[PDB]
Design a protein around this nucleic acid. Sequence first.
RNA 1: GGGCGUGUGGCGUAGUCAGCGCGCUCCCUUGCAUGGGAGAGGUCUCCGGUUCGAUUCCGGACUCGUCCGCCA
RNA 2: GGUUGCGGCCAUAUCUACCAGAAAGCACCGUUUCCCGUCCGAUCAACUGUAGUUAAGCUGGUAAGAGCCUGACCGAGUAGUGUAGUGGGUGACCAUACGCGAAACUCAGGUGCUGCAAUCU
RNA 3: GAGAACAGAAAUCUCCAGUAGAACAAAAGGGUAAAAGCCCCCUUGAUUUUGAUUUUCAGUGUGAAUACAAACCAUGAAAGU
RNA 4: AAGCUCGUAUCAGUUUUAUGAGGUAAAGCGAAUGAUUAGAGGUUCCGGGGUCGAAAUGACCUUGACCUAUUCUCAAACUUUAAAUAUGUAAGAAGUCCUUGUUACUUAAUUGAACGUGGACAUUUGAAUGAAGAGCUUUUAGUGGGCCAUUUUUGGUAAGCA
Lengths: 142, 169, 294, 71, 159
Amino acid sequence: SATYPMQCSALRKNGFVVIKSRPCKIVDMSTSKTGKHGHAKVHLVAIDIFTGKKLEDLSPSTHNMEVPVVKRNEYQLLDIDDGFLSLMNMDGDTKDDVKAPEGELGDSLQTAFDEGKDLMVTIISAMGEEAAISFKEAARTD
Amino acid sequence: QNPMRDLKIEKLVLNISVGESGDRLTRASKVLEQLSGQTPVQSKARYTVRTFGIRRNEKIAVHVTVRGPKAEEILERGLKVKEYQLRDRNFSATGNFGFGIDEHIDLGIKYDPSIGIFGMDFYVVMNRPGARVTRRKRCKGTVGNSHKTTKEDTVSWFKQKYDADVLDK
Amino acid sequence: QKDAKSSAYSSRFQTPFRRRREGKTDYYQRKRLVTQHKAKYNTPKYRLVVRFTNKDIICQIISSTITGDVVLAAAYSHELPRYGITHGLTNWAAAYATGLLIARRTLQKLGLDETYKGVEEVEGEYELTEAVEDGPRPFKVFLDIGLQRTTTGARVFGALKGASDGGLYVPHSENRFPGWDFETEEIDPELLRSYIFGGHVSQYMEELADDDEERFSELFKGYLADDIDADSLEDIYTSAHEAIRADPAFKPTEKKFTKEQYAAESKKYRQTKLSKEERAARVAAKIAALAGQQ
Amino acid sequence: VEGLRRARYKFPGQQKIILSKKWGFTNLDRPEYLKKREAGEVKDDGAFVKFLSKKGSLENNIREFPEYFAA
Amino acid sequence: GKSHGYRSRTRYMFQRDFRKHGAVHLSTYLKVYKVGDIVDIKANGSIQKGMPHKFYQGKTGVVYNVTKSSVGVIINKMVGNRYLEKRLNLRVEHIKHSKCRQEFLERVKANAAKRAEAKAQGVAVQLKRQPAQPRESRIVSTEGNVPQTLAPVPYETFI
RNA sequence: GGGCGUGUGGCGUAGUCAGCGCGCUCCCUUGCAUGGGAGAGGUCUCCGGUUCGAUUCCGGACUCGUCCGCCA
RNA sequence: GGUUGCGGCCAUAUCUACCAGAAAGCACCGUUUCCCGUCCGAUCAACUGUAGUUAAGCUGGUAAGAGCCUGACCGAGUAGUGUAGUGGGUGACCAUACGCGAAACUCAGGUGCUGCAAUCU
RNA sequence: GAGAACAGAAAUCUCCAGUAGAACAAAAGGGUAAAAGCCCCCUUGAUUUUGAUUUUCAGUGUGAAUACAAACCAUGAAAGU
RNA sequence: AAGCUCGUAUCAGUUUUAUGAGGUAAAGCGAAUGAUUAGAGGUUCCGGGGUCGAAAUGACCUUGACCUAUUCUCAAACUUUAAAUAUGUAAGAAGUCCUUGUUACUUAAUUGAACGUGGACAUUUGAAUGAAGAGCUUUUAGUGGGCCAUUUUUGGUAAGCA
């Protein structure tokens, strides 16, 4: 399956959750007892990985929250044209479906490709939507 | 006494460890192939060692096994490279002996600028007739104590044949 | 000092079976051979045991009991001089002739020989002894090649081919016979027939006698001593085959002596054990010798 | 005996002080060990003593324990 | 949690033994079982197929079915307050014939032989077994066996 | 008392069974702005186990920062 | 009685170090055209039984041998244990009655037996 | 353990000893030496049809497993699996 | 509770005989695994500290490892060995033996497998003791909080504790 359930108390920091059908990454967790007799409630503060928005939800601790599958994958650039990166996989596979980043990451990547470094791109998959998060340079195998 | 106790060369094995796969490996394999007259066998690496830079299974060494009078001839060429002087440490307790040499130019192949220079390890395995008892599949047995090769017999044979002298150390 | 085994090692050691220690029996193969379908209650399972020593081929028909194995009939290659084969007693055709002899002998002593005549006119084709209707089934037997390597061209399969043409029903495929092409999965019958009639040794006889004569005097010396040339071995194989199909009756030798006559000499030659009292006298003399201050 | 009697106060329960009939830390009696050590069939170790047996190889039994066989 | 698997608590039960590991000898494959034979069940840990459960270890039953490599055995199992009938398919490495049955058959044939030979005379055959009777009168002599007087031994440390 | 997290070169940290950036120190290049290249620098908190190999997998220990310890 | 082929029980058969082996049989041994397999006719395949050798394998013997096996009234009726008492003892535990009964240790002996077929001075 | 250039504690090769002290996906326990381990070759029986039996047990279900029958296959020289 | 089919048995909280199975108690560690005390003899291309040494793959002591023969003490999740008490089966008539019928199974084969026909063996008919009747079926009540004593035993310092 694309996504799998988990418990709120089983969740912990720097893990992925589904909040309002968005892949989110937790920055804050806090548990407070509801009433003296009652079970504690978990208040979760998380950041969407793709959009960067801050989303929070509180739930019972025993409640089950949905968790996405996030895969980070490593590729080499071939060209940046029309806002669409062209990447090259190990064993020689090529994809052009990735859109170029639109922020300061995209600006730095564009300048780095213009001045000619060999750039290593990390793109993540979660719940059927695809994006690029970071780039490095290959220190060896020039 | 001595009807068929005569020592003989079971085999000569020539080992080259280039240490890393590729063009060298092929050049060392070509040198071994032209020296032996047989195609050599490359040997994989058992474990990954960082310090050597090796990883598991890249065929890091190449070796060949030659038997008979041809092996005797290459051993003659190796001994005249070594000037018929060998250390006492070279011989083993079982009776087998080996030595290591640098370059095939001393062996007389002559030099090609592409192929480079590779040294070799020569190892001679000595046995008496009747060694098939250990090797055969049916009725496999162990060789008797008197008939076993030993260090004193192999140094006596190496002094008598090849008219060589062993070093005291 | 180096080759030393502790008492703990020698006490915890478990020896294998005696035949495994001698290296003569593969018990993994033996279990799969001699075991029976338990609903066939006391039905024996019969092995054509073919063994190759130097200067002999041994063929036996053996079933298994708890007290030991039982032989119906045996046929060795050294009784082939009775049928006219004197040289090459371990070649591929000698294995064929030994298989034919043990097949004809077993069908004669079972009384299954007037039916199931086998392949009378041999040509090298691959076929099995099929069951005739409204009568008894053919005698079923399975090979025991032992530790010997299965190999296309090995002479255990020559013994199989001889036994199969003799009228035994032995299950086999044809892909281990000489002449089997690997790429085209078919059997070449004329090369197999040449091997049955000794073509591979006669062709060598010609192609070595024409050039290298000292080898032709070293080996094949008995062929010159008995004036056997290259082409006559085919018809002496044919005459040997028809002599086997005449009488496999196995007259044994006359033994030249008696069992106790051999036993007297061998009992005289064998060494005996030392008893307890003379062992004690020996150790007392040893104590008086070395420990008695010389 | 007085040292063991002083040590007995540090232990719970009841303990007894018994003078053994054995020679030292061995397991033979005093006259048995005396009639064994008059022959050469004992040989000292670092603190203990090794004994001769009638079993084993005679060569080892003669390189060890020579005075008993010096009869 | 608790654990009750199929081979739970079978450690020493399904160990092989000391110094008789390895392959099994061919007498177990050459032995012949018929329907109605009485067999003992002892599992062989070297053979994992056709294994009995740990309950039937050391149990004795009756053959009711013979197949290619196995034997069907009937055991009576106490379940609650009655015995139930259990049918087991076991490979022949895990069974052997019960020797008590063949001893009883030897008693039957020797007993019939005694009855047959003594029927020619009518000498009150007395074919039932009898247990250990009390031993009867005897006279013990002291010729070379004069009695030796014994006494209790006093106490010693012995350490 | 219990639970959770925490230690990576000075800092930020990332990680596959030790990488850069900014620091540091040199060298080189060219402003309006610079940039580049070298090095010295890390027992991945510590100690074990596992594993071909462990930052990574596990166990134990230390430090620090948190959160609970309530009804009578 | 020796040896070979196939075995059964699977050390009384194994291991260590020496010694011996008539005859026959195994074995080492000689060869690379053919079938076949290898880096390497070393193993495996094939051919000859010829050129040779009991040196080895194998078999047997030796050893106050290691191990293993058997037995003992050897330890020891000991340890342990089923049953009994309004038995002892603060207790820990221990005696007794009616029964069952070890292991280590010590000592003595032993070191393959045998089935089917073939063959042998 | 004893040897062989670079090559050493650990690279590859050779011999000897080696009852398993290794390995068999994982927890632990069993089992395994001409193998159940390592390497190579060929394959899809990890197939079809419904019954019976064992464990848990009410002798219900579920899961897992055992031995067959009727086909159709794989592999091997074959017994067989 | 209602009975039903039979009339001393296709029984038994028992013993004996024969034959299995087990890994606890005990024992063992100069037996495997693991723990563990002390010396002794050796090994240094093969350790570390000192002292003598130009230094030395030097020397002399000492201390650590490894090996060899010993020595002291142990194991719920160690074991070669291995009880007592409990525990499976058998002690016949539904048995044994002789002869020969069936089959589409099985065998090279009337070879075997299973079930049979006909015939022989009877009150010591196959050990002891006792049987109070033996076997079978339907239907339904209450119950499904337990506790104590001896012996074995777990957690706990212990408990009229769990």
